[PDB]
Design an enzyme around this catalytic site. Sequence first.
Site, PDB file in Angstrom:
ATOM      1  N   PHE B  32      -0.076 -39.959  18.125  1.00  0.00           N
ATOM      2  CA  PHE B  32      -1.377 -40.427  17.623  1.00  0.00           C
ATOM      3  C   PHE B  32      -1.309 -40.637  16.100  1.00  0.00           C
ATOM      4  CE2 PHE B  32      -6.167 -40.181  17.483  1.00  0.00           C
ATOM      5  CZ  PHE B  32      -6.345 -39.774  16.174  1.00  0.00           C
ATOM      6  N   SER B  98       5.046 -35.652  19.243  1.00  0.00           N
ATOM      7  CA  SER B  98       3.657 -35.218  19.060  1.00  0.00           C
ATOM      8  C   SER B  98       2.908 -35.324  20.412  1.00  0.00           C
ATOM      9  CB  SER B  98       3.008 -36.017  17.881  1.00  0.00           C
ATOM     10  OG  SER B  98       1.730 -35.535  17.453  1.00  0.00           O
ATOM     11  N   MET B  99       1.845 -36.130  20.465  1.00  0.00           N
ATOM     12  CA  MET B  99       1.095 -36.331  21.702  1.00  0.00           C
ATOM     13  C   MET B  99       1.994 -36.606  22.899  1.00  0.00           C
ATOM     14  SD  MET B  99      -2.525 -38.368  21.543  1.00  0.00           S
ATOM     15  CE  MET B  99      -3.082 -38.157  23.226  1.00  0.00           C
ATOM     16  N   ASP B 228       5.953 -29.304   8.691  1.00  0.00           N
ATOM     17  CA  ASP B 228       4.919 -29.922   9.528  1.00  0.00           C
ATOM     18  C   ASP B 228       3.569 -29.289   9.227  1.00  0.00           C
ATOM     19  OD1 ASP B 228       3.337 -31.113  11.600  1.00  0.00           O
ATOM     20  OD2 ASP B 228       5.125 -31.367  12.857  1.00  0.00           O
ATOM     21  N   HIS B 257       5.338 -33.888   9.761  1.00  0.00           N
ATOM     22  CA  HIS B 257       5.036 -34.272  11.152  1.00  0.00           C
ATOM     23  C   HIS B 257       5.687 -35.610  11.493  1.00  0.00           C
ATOM     24  CE1 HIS B 257       3.096 -33.880  14.962  1.00  0.00           C
ATOM     25  NE2 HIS B 257       2.346 -34.962  14.824  1.00  0.00           N
TER      26      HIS B 257
END
Lengths: 441, 441, 441, 441
Positions: B32, B98-99, B228, B257
């Site tokens: 995202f 991530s997502m 992160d 991140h």
Amino acid sequence: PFITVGQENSTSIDLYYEDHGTGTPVVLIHGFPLSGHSWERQSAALLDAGARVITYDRRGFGQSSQPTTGYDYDTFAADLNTVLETLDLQDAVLVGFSMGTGEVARYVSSYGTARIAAVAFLASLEPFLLKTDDNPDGAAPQEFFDGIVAAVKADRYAFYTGFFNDFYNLDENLGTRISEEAVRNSWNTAASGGFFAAAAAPTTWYTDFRADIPRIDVPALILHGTGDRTLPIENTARVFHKALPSAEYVEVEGAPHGLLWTHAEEVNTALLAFLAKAQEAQKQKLLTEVETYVLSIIPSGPLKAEIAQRLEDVFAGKNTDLEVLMEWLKTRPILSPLTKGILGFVFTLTVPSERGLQRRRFVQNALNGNGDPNNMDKAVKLYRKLKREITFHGAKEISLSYSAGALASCMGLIYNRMGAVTTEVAFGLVCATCEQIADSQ
Amino acid sequence: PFITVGQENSTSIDLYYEDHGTGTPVVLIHGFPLSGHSWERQSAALLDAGARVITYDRRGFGQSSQPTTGYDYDTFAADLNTVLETLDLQDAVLVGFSMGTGEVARYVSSYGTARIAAVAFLASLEPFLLKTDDNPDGAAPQEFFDGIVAAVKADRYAFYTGFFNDFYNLDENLGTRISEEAVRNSWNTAASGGFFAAAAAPTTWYTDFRADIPRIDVPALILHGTGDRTLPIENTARVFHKALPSAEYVEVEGAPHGLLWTHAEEVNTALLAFLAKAQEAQKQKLLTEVETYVLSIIPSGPLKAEIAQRLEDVFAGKNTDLEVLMEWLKTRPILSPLTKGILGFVFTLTVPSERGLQRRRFVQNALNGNGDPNNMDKAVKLYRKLKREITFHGAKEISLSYSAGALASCMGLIYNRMGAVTTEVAFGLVCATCEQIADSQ
Amino acid sequence: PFITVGQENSTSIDLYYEDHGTGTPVVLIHGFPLSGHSWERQSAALLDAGARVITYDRRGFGQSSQPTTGYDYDTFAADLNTVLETLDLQDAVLVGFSMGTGEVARYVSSYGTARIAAVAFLASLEPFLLKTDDNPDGAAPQEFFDGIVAAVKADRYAFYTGFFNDFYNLDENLGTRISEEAVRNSWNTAASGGFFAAAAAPTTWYTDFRADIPRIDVPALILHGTGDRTLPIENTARVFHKALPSAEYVEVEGAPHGLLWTHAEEVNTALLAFLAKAQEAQKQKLLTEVETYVLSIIPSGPLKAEIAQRLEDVFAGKNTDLEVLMEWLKTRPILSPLTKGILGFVFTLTVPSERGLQRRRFVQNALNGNGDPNNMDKAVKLYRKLKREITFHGAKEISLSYSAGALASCMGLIYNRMGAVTTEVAFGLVCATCEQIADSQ
Amino acid sequence: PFITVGQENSTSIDLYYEDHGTGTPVVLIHGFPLSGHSWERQSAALLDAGARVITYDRRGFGQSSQPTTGYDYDTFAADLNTVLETLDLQDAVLVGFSMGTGEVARYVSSYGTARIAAVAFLASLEPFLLKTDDNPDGAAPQEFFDGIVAAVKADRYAFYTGFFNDFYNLDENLGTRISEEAVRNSWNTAASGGFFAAAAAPTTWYTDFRADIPRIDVPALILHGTGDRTLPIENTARVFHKALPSAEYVEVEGAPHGLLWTHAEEVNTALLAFLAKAQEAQKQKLLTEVETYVLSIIPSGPLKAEIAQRLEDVFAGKNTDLEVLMEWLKTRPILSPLTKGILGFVFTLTVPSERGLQRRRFVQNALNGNGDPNNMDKAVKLYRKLKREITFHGAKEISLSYSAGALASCMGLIYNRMGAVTTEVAFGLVCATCEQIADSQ
């Protein structure tokens, strides 16, 4: 193997024949009282030199049927005609020995030289053996031939013995140029011909071939043994050459009638030379025809100059680096990928050495019929028919009945070695393709 | 390109995807608020390293449709399922960022690892982000996520700006590891996702993946940036590795991140290593399966020993002289010409270098389907279907529905380069053939 | 709108295109790293000047698919081919800018100028950009291009920024000839192309177009900015004009590479004038093409002189009193009523103003297909097909497959306004008719 | 009679063969330069001893076609294969003499021993005749064979004479073991083979059969004359027996190469005794094959002991009182009437003498297919097919495709003499029935 040439009562009349090697067809027509196997010294040489050898046994001799009909040169020439048509011989050489030289003259004379590239006459009957008022150079009077007939009818078995004596000059040649065993085989072959043919054959020997000779259209060879006791060189080869000055003419010094065995060398070397001269011209003819078809699809210009030069050079035998040739084609602007594939195919086919080069992707892609299954289906159908073809024109004719997509796919099939055909048939295929493509423009 | 995953009212829900390269399939699932294109630094490396790269845009992002439904990990995993089934991916690597790491866990957990060779989790959500009584290691309270939703709904455009700040540690990395232009592109990508998805996505972030983790069946990689700011390494990667000790585990020192761009190297090198370890094992598996099928047609004995040794050596990568290999096969007694053709095919296919060797006549003759047109017809039909196959088993399955004559002809078709298929599909073809032939015995 | 040009793995490769206006087709091929929309200044002018404008996005750019394959001028030219064939473009102008000029040369060279009326090269790559031994005028060494590839792979986003700097001479032109916002849009367009295409494109820039240039068949325009920092006018347009002296040649003084926007004016004015010349030549060709067909049915003599003079005058635009013209035709001796009807039709069709004159009875009677229902049936069938035609030759080709009675009836149908077709299609109809009638004589 | 084995140009390649007697098939493969007729001394003995005798003429010899292709042991073995498949020979003995021993080894080696019960090698080429570094026991250097080829090409007629000299040891055996007339016939046979085959044959003589020998699966006989001048027993039979210790081995003291005629006696006596042993073994195999099938339907127990003892005794030839046997079966408890009928059938079939006993009602009732017309219909259909079978396995295979009711009805049909088949075919029928019935349990 047999070819049927007629019918006698309830039986057909079949000629025994053999069909060996690949290349330009050479048809050997034997003498009396022997068979196609009497050419065995010549056949071996021709096979080694790279020719297709056809022999057959005249009706009444060797392994052919033994009718009591048709012992005359028109029938014998009709027999030969049937053989040539049955096998669809194109660009053939006809070689006759003794009796066989009567077939050669009479066929050429009546049927013409459509299938025929060259002729050869060895120990010839020509031009007329009968000694008459109008034929002073004739070798013997009618009563003389009447004599042989009477002798064969009396005993033919005994007759063959004295015949092979003079046929081979055994008083000179036995244990020297011909073995006793070779002579024994000859007698066995003769004894195996039909009784009726044996007595009927000698009546055909004084056939007048004088009107046949002006009909001889194509390059000819006349070859005779000067020690010929059976057909005196003075009444036969020497007066024949006057009637056909144009003929290449070879006297074999002290060679007998049966010079095929006793002087096979001098025969086979000379015959070889004659084939060699005929063969190269035929090859050149094949090369130049292909070239016109191949060039017909290329746009006019300097590239078309470079391409034609290259064809001509590989065709002349200058072994070129196919790898270099192919890269050049590959990288040529203007030329369509289809055109490049066709040329790619032609060059790998005609180049002297492929030098273990892998097939080219640009050609495989060019000759894949667009990977279309109907094209490929038809190409496989055409391939089946092409396997049965032996000539350039037969191949080209059947190929032109297929669409260009199918033709290109067929070429890919051969290119990729998924099938195999003879060289001249492959040429016909690529030429039909070029013809179809050129016509679309 | 699109894959349809559902319907919303009058419209279908389509996911934008891309499909690049050839080799083992690697499926990249973005984070995202970005799209499949955010993997571009990784895609380039994977493509150079020889993998098939699949990217897609999650519903509501990038070029995918923008519904107002289905923002939850079961739907997202069902979306992924549809993609994998639609493309018939076998032996795939799933890489989530991530997502995307939520998709990887939930798909593996629910649908199992049938298509899946290995998994990788980069900047993971796992195991649970919500800080509760039973989840003390959770990164934040519920009120915190409620906050992000409220912020996105307020302005999402402005929101993306502060988000990419912490996403990339721009205070550290701008002008250094990330350019201003690269950041501008990221914002543009985000601004292009659907308004509804933007606000709905953050509600999926505290999904509890704790029961999904024990389901992870296959080799795994966990990779996180120690800098992160978005997913604190201490509440995510570090407690995740305790839950999956088995995972290979890599900390990227001071990486933010958005480490895919800022530390693409460390990422791509590590990811590359993981692919490299997965890929060689898969290749070995492919090699040994082929071998059993190939050996099944050979009679038991010392020859079968020599053959197996040779396969194994070329399979291990010992470049052998194919010319030497082929002559040996060619001259082997006992082996049927069919068997020799199959082995001939296998060896040329698997040998490191063919060294520009021409195709072998013994193989072309062995794999010609007896020149039978029905065989060849079916072989061409099979070929069409095989062009659409990408896996060994799919190829082998469809091939087994054809007769051995047609299969052998198809192999000849490929051998002779009249058609082309992928390596693994070709293996399936030759293995179906071996299976059919073995069964006849 | 999309045109599919190929397949990559599970996805097809589709090119985004647009198709605006009516009239002679002009196909605009954009430069790197932009899309069809970069022609918007030119499109507007061409649309106002009355042309059909076709734009498309090269694979990997704008809204086209983004494969990782086919980044080379043969593929790009094949892509263009597919577009032209898909739309059945006849008599088209191909205009390339920068990269686009590679398509123009390579398509003309390989596929020929069958569909193509004229070509234009703006900010050309030609003839070869690579500086070698054999190419001394080359703009840069190989290592230079290798550099750009490396730069794009490093960041492409950042890369576009410095690229548009020199692309537009922003140090000169920003705030003046190009706005900051126009530049922002360009970067956005570039950022939107595929990552792979971005890095692969620069490898196609030193393609050698030297063998393509002699293939240029049709009228050409070469146009370059003298302030071109991207393609130095001295290594590109100036040596290109020496290779094609025949080309009309325009230097835009101090114009940068991105002259389509900065100097849209000077660009549009050269383009429109050149297009206008080409249009006039096309019109003259059509007049000779119509006139020759029309004259072919008239008996040689002084009347044929009066008729030809009149055609030529109306064709030149001298508005003649159609009422006077028609009475003259009507009252001409010798001419068949059929012939008079055909001429009647042609004149009402080509005359500048019909001046609200009613249709003539002599023409209606002449073009009624003898009131035969089969003629009329076929004429209606032809009409249906002609509604789908847009070119003179397509119309003429389909028309020639019908009988003269049916063709005459079709003409009456149009004459009487019972149906309608475009002017050039109507010309093809009347010319097919004249061809059929002339052939009967 | 002919079997076609291929095609040469326009002609097929046909092998002359003969097929005499009834019983176990024995296939005799002649030596150079003779034909199938050279086995005449052996054929007479085998015919009297009750075997089926198959002879054929190798391509190029005797009455077979005389191609100029295929003179190598793979072709020769393929020729043999075609013969065996054409005649559907099962359980055959292959006997080769001289050249013929090359066929035997190469066929067994490549095609396996599926049709083959035993093999015999007389005056063998094996294992390799060429004297090399790796083959020290070789009989001659390459230059020696090159010599024979040259000699045959020079005269073959004369050549045969010196060849038969050493072939027969005529200096020892003329007027004694071989007549002058027998030798004359041999020369005639040789003179009758093709010229090309004569010269090409000697090149096949130093074929390396060393890898063929381990493939010999079945019982073998090696037989050589110790006075063999053509194939020195020390370089051929003696080193061959070391390679195949298992072979039964017979030296014929002072026997020449042509031992088939000179020592026909010693030859026939070894052949017939060895054949007899093979025949007895085959019979024992058949007994186990019939007996096991018959026993498979009987419940295990003491009765099954009495039954098996009885089968074995009649099978061993102890002529039993069938009347006593049948009453015993008839009155046996436990056995189903079906089972009793099958045994009833077997015993009347295998018992040495039926002693003019009428058929038994209990068997007729047991084998009537329940008088069902569909059973009987199928049984009649099967019967038709069984009339065409000559082997146990062929019969059994076709029978298993019918239902048990139909099989039982067929057996009744034979039992009741409403039809007739050969013994081994009848065994196959009853065994298929037993197999079907056993499988139902």
